[PDB]
Ligand binder design. Structure first.
Ligand code: BMP
Ligand code: BMP
Lengths: 218, 220
């Protein structure tokens, strides 16, 4: 997966007008947008097709799928029908739930990203202790795409070690949550950035600035 | 101090087609006044489906969104969900206390309820969730969570969850019917059972619901 400027926009604005305007403002800097439930639940799944029509970007549906296998399959079907190129799945609910997602993705020509460890403080309670094993489970299942936390580079590095250099790894928590763009790209293929761009006075200037700071990694 | 679930039976409406979802829910409305709507239906038909159910049936709506993000995003998801008219939302506990608190804070501000999912009913739950479930439940109690979800298919685990949360907490339980859980046995511990496929895929969903209710008649 070739992500322009190694930068994925997390578009979590909840207003269609603002989301389209801001994305348009930064479109020259990205070709990959992560769309999550804040936008989808506020404006509908039709927003995905609208982004493809306007921007011709790839779309990662950040739905943190975390149900039983039966329901996971339905969620993935509905999501790929709406035009998502990929979907993010939690690993914590175990292997059968992940495999359900992998099956639908294969059927529809899409990718699954496995969320290992998360970036927020609460991740330390239960997720962090399971994260290495979740990553190994991903390897066992043939998962090739992973998500891990920018805010804990030692954990992100360990995740990279587990999955190998051939796997694709993207990482949120850059900017607002304190992660550093350059340090994160030591280990991740691409960084995910939301508020640092979309809440900025000048979103285009914010995006440009982040890219300038990693210019030599591109 | 808890929602009054008619017949102790909650419909899991996981049909993905608006016409079928509406038809089946209409057919069982005399037996059930509380409906669980999840992402299969919402991602297929939009959040306005919640409005449509309220308009047609006047049923309570539990949004089964298994919220499992960072606190910032959890807040936004809860806000959007309550704005659409959901009475309650289901939240995962495994992402930890700050993520749960974020949902509780929005629910408090907006006058709605959070249900905390503590262990799940599928085989995969044994890998990571089961080992964390007792602590997730205890965390819920510490945070002031009053409503919980736990699995019908592991009666020993459901019983332990009930112990942890106490008799005053509200507990609902899926996995009844299609996944093998027994209505009566489950209601030893849960306030209400959640049933999906064994009602909505039945030739006669009303008869399926009526039959389940007949089987637990002495527990109502
Ligand atoms: O561990 C994780 C996994 C995520 O998907 N995310 C997501 O990545 C984005 C981060 O946005 P921001 O740059 O504003 O902090 C949000 O959409 C959030 O839901 C995260 O922050 N941490
Ligand atoms: O542990 C759990 C938690 C759930 O929410 N569920 C949900 O409960 C419902 C079960 O439906 P069914 O009766 O068709 O098996 C589904 O909506 C599923 O997503 C579950 O099955 N197990």
């Amino acid at each position: 997966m070739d992500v322009m400027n190694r930068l994925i926009l997390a578009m979590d604005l909840m207003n269609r007008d603002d989301a389209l305007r801001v994305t348009g403002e930064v479109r020259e800097y990205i070709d990959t947008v992560k769309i999550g439930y804040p936008l989808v639940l506020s404006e509908g799944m039709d927003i995905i097709a609208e982004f493809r029509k306007r921007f011709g970007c790839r779309i990662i549906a950040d739905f943190k799928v975390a149900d039983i296998p039966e329901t996971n399959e339905k969620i993935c079907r509905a999501t790929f029908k709406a035009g998502a190129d990929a979907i993010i799945v939690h690993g914590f609910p175990g292997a059968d739930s992940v495999r359900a997602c992998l099956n639908v993705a294969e059927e529809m020509g899409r990718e699954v990203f496995l969320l290992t460890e998360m970036s927020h403080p609460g991740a330390e309670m239960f997720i962090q202790g399971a994260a290495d094993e979740i990553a190994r489970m991903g390897v066992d299942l043939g998962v090739k795409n992973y998500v891990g936390p920018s805010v804990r580079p030692e954990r992100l590095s360990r995740l990279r070690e587990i999955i190998g250099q051939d796997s694709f790894l993207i990482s949120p928590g850059v900017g607002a949550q304190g992660g550093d763009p350059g340090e994160t790209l030591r280990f991740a293929d691409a960084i995910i950035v939301g508020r640092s761009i979309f809440l900025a006075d000048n979103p285009a200037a914010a995006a440009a600035g982040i890219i300038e700071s990693i210019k030599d990694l591109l």
